[PDB]
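Worked example 3. Consider a protein that binds calcium ion.
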Amino acid sequence: TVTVTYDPSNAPSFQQEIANAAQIWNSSVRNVQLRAGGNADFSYYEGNDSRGSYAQTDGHGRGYIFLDYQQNQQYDSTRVTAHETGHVLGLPDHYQGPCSELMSGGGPGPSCTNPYPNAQERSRVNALWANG
Ligand SMILES: [Ca+2]
Ligand SMILES: [Zn+2]
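Given these inputs, the predicted complex is written out as structure tokens:
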């Protein structure tokens, strides 16, 4: 198991939802775990961007996530935050997917509140982190 360290301190409005998203990923996958702490690999920020939330990441643990205020009010914020964290873990956008896919993001609309990755998404993250 590898540990990826995140810094939540620059997204003060989202502390509970970041904790929730980290606990959802930690409860779902075996080969990587997320922990808050110093000398972090990736960081969370907040603000306004009409495009919504986004991730600037290499897809293997590094970079940052921007959490947009409007998207996190109109959609379930746990799903949004867990979704963007999925990009840092290596998973791509799949907007045409159903609500049971976390990586379909906002595609299924604001009635979809599911923040958990499905079995295939879990398997893919485990394989991407199998060798660190
Ligand atoms: Ca929620
Ligand atoms: Zn996405």
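Take a moment to read the result before moving on. The chain has one domain: 1-132. The domain at 1-132 is CATH 3.40.390.10 (Collagenase (Catalytic Domain)).
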